[PDB]
Amino acid sequence: TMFRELGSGKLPLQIEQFERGKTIFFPGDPAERVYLLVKGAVKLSRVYESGEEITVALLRENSVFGVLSSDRFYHAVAFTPVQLFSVPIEFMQKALIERPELANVMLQGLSSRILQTEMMIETLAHRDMGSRLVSFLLILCRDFGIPSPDGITIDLKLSHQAIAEAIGSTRVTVTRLLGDLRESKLIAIHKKRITVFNPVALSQQ
């Protein structure tokens, strides 16, 4: 209603909620609708000509996905429970003409995606899995961090497998690596909540 004034055109608004882990769209599906992440985080990954599926970005609130305008190599899954708005590609293509300042809303989405993808670069470039885990955790911490007495706690319930799918590891490797981190007193875990302290210090790994 307040978002309606931008435009004021009839809006084909599609509101959908997803549970943690559910796929928002699969690679290959036409997936025409452009999307707007209103609550939560989305794990976006790409399928390359090899067949390898690599994570490319943990999108945060206000990020925009599905704005191709061939492709269709992208898989989107709800990293947390997510709430999404989507409008079809046709409406956007026309509205970017009619509604002119919203080019800016587009740039902000695209700019954000760039930054987010650059943060996956620094993660996936690590070679050693433990640094790669450490790198992903800090991403999660900046997006989901809460000042806890012991340090910063991600406010999230994280599957070990979900972390593995992000960093390109296996759940067992991830479970062992987190344990190493716990044993060395770099982190603490309670009921699927992970806490870190000296986070700039934690990168040492």
Binding site membership for a nucleoside 3',5'-cyclic phosphate: which residues?
1-113
**Shortest distance, CB of residue 42 to a second copy, whole angstroms?**
15
Q: Is 49 in the site for a second copy (CB under 8 A)?
A: yes
CB 199 within 8 A of CB 152: yes
Name the residue type at position 71.
D
Edge-first strand order for the sheet with 151-154 is 145-148, 151-154, 193-196, 187-190
Distance (Å, rounded) from C-alpha 184 to C-alpha 188? Answer: 10
Binding residues: 1-113
Q: Does 172 bind a second copy (CB under 8 A)?
A: no
Burial of 103 (0-12, 13-18, 19+ CB in 10 A): exposed
- Site residues (CB under 8 A) for a second copy, limited to 52-81: 52, 54-56, 67-69
38 or 106: whose CB is closer to a second copy? 106
Which spans of this chain sit near a second copy (rule: CB under 8 A)?
46, 48-50, 52, 54-56, 67-69, 96-97, 100-101, 103-104, 106-107, 110-111, 113-114, 117-118, 120-122, 124-125, 127, 168, 200, 203
